[PDB]
Write a protein that holds these residues in place. Structure first.
Motif, PDB file in Angstrom:
ATOM      1  N   UNK A 134       0.752  -0.977  -0.019  1.00 18.32           N
ATOM      2  CA  UNK A 134      -0.015   0.014   0.187  1.00 18.32           C
ATOM      3  C   UNK A 134       0.756   1.221  -0.181  1.00 18.32           C
ATOM      4  N   UNK A 135       0.289   2.234  -0.569  1.00 24.16           N
ATOM      5  CA  UNK A 135       1.054   3.699  -0.367  1.00 24.16           C
ATOM      6  C   UNK A 135       0.951   4.108   1.197  1.00 24.16           C
ATOM      7  N   UNK A 192      -2.880   8.370   7.688  1.00 23.55           N
ATOM      8  CA  UNK A 192      -4.156   7.689   7.882  1.00 23.55           C
ATOM      9  C   UNK A 192      -4.270   6.230   8.016  1.00 23.55           C
ATOM     10  N   UNK A 219      -4.891   3.471  11.101  1.00 25.54           N
ATOM     11  CA  UNK A 219      -5.884   2.835  10.918  1.00 25.54           C
ATOM     12  C   UNK A 219      -5.371   1.157  11.400  1.00 25.54           C
ATOM     13  N   UNK A 269      -8.041  -4.894  16.439  1.00 24.21           N
ATOM     14  CA  UNK A 269      -8.453  -4.961  15.029  1.00 24.21           C
ATOM     15  C   UNK A 269      -7.745  -5.934  14.505  1.00 24.21           C
ATOM     16  N   UNK A 270      -8.096  -6.519  13.428  1.00 28.24           N
ATOM     17  CA  UNK A 270      -7.221  -7.622  12.661  1.00 28.24           C
ATOM     18  C   UNK A 270      -5.847  -7.269  12.541  1.00 28.24           C
ATOM     19  N   UNK A 319      -8.128   9.115   0.140  1.00 29.27           N
ATOM     20  CA  UNK A 319      -6.693   8.970   0.549  1.00 29.27           C
ATOM     21  C   UNK A 319      -6.300   7.513  -0.304  1.00 29.27           C
ATOM     22  N   UNK A 320      -5.429   7.734  -0.914  1.00 29.70           N
ATOM     23  CA  UNK A 320      -4.764   6.823  -2.017  1.00 29.70           C
ATOM     24  C   UNK A 320      -4.128   5.595  -1.237  1.00 29.70           C
ATOM     25  N   UNK A 321      -4.555   4.413  -1.382  1.00 31.25           N
ATOM     26  CA  UNK A 321      -4.115   3.366  -0.809  1.00 31.25           C
ATOM     27  C   UNK A 321      -3.335   2.196  -1.952  1.00 31.25           C
ATOM     28  N   UNK A 331     -10.317  -3.126   9.185  1.00 28.64           N
ATOM     29  CA  UNK A 331      -9.543  -1.922   9.845  1.00 28.64           C
ATOM     30  C   UNK A 331      -9.788  -0.581   9.097  1.00 28.64           C
ATOM     31  N   UNK A 332     -10.308  -0.353   8.042  1.00 27.97           N
ATOM     32  CA  UNK A 332     -10.573   0.580   7.279  1.00 27.97           C
ATOM     33  C   UNK A 332     -11.728   1.278   8.123  1.00 27.97           C
ATOM     34  N   UNK A 333     -12.732   0.612   8.287  1.00 31.82           N
ATOM     35  CA  UNK A 333     -14.137   1.181   8.673  1.00 31.82           C
ATOM     36  C   UNK A 333     -14.245   1.384  10.040  1.00 31.82           C
ATOM     37  N   UNK A 334     -13.317   0.989  11.103  1.00 28.46           N
ATOM     38  CA  UNK A 334     -13.472   0.990  12.356  1.00 28.46           C
ATOM     39  C   UNK A 334     -13.791   2.380  12.756  1.00 28.46           C
ATOM     40  N   UNK A 394     -14.633   5.999  14.375  1.00 29.53           N
ATOM     41  CA  UNK A 394     -13.795   6.947  14.990  1.00 29.53           C
ATOM     42  C   UNK A 394     -12.227   6.962  14.602  1.00 29.53           C
ATOM     43  N   UNK A 395     -11.954   6.616  13.270  1.00 33.68           N
ATOM     44  CA  UNK A 395     -10.571   6.467  12.811  1.00 33.68           C
ATOM     45  C   UNK A 395     -10.560   7.148  11.667  1.00 33.68           C
ATOM     46  N   UNK A 396      -9.038   7.513  11.126  1.00 35.96           N
ATOM     47  CA  UNK A 396      -9.025   8.341   9.854  1.00 35.96           C
ATOM     48  C   UNK A 396      -9.715   7.949   8.701  1.00 35.96           C
ATOM     49  N   UNK A 397      -9.742   6.417   8.434  1.00 36.27           N
ATOM     50  CA  UNK A 397     -10.339   6.214   7.240  1.00 36.27           C
ATOM     51  C   UNK A 397     -11.826   5.690   6.952  1.00 36.27           C
ATOM     52  N   UNK A 398     -12.516   5.795   8.253  1.00 34.14           N
ATOM     53  CA  UNK A 398     -13.879   5.140   8.395  1.00 34.14           C
ATOM     54  C   UNK A 398     -14.905   6.120   7.630  1.00 34.14           C
TER      55      UNK A 398
END
Ligand SMILES: CCN(CC)c1cccc(NC(C)=O)c1
Ligand SMILES: [Mg+2]
Lengths: 150, 152
Positions: free
Chosen positions: A50-51, A55, A59, A65-66, B47-49, B60-63, B65-69
């Protein structure tokens, strides 16, 4: 140059993520591969390629979390894998209050030239492992200096 | 199965495992799969991934109160292209009035693309799909995976 701008962008993303995690006492383990190849450890984790972003780094390490248990390994400016195994140091010279996150960081630093950043879940303290030694209680400026030196 | 078909099957397995986990825990999620209409303009808002798919990363992305959710994850074939993306909000009167912005965003993108979007409601845990301007609600795990397999 493009390579220099990219390296600084990555340093900025790492430091922003580490600062966030230190404030909230989120445990983290982030190893940056250097000249010694770490493919065998990357292969133990979840592939990302990943880039880098602050953020995504935050995460990944959210508790329960996993992806949070184990090391993120970075390579060629991109998060290679998360939740990776690192070897636990048997060094008797690590501060006795520290646990497995810090021993894993020191352990990988004994057999590679990598630089590993650790955030303590107990104190939010930031440390770096390199060459078998742990550099503890780093300020923001000190961590940046280590990344730029590396 | 060719490698392309096996990769597709692994991606569907990763998505369904993530969606089933988030539904059980009432983790709100918004996940758009790009098809033949390119979604570059919306990918570029996030945000590019450009990351390999995994059930673990999706979760992990959608948890909360996190930056990515907040915002949409947009997938391109077997990659997570970007997270926290903007999608346009639908004004369709066929969106149940109790539903919030995630469902309206999913229908919105489905009106201007051929994409398939999956939504998990944080209120009920129910799973829905938006496609071609229509919202299909309260999907079983089996129905969602049959929809994904049919989409290819
Ligand atoms: C550096 C701190 N940042 C910026 C990425 C942060 C941390 C937690 C949450 C959110 N944003 C949300 C929850 O919308 C943002
Ligand atoms: Mg029904």
């Amino acid at each position: 140059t493009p390579v220099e701008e990219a390296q600084q962008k990555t340093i900025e993303a790492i430091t922003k993520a580490i600062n966030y995690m230190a404030k909230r006492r989120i445990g983290a383990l982030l190893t940056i591969e250097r000249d010694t190849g770490m493919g065998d450890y990357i292969e133990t984790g979840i592939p990302l390629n990943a880039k880098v972003s602050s953020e995504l780094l935050i995460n990944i390490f959210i508790p329960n979390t996993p992806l949070h248990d184990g090391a993120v390994i970075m390579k060629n400016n991109e998060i290679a894998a998360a939740a990776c195994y690192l070897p636990l140091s048997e060094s008797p010279f690590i501060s006795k209050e520290l646990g497995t996150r810090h021993r894993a960081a020191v352990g990988i630093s004994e057999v590679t030239d990598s630089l590993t950043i650790i955030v303590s879940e107990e104190t939010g303290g930031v440390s770096v492992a390199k060459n078998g030694d742990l550099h503890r209680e780093l300020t923001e400026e000190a961590l940046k200096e280590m990344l730029e030196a590396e």
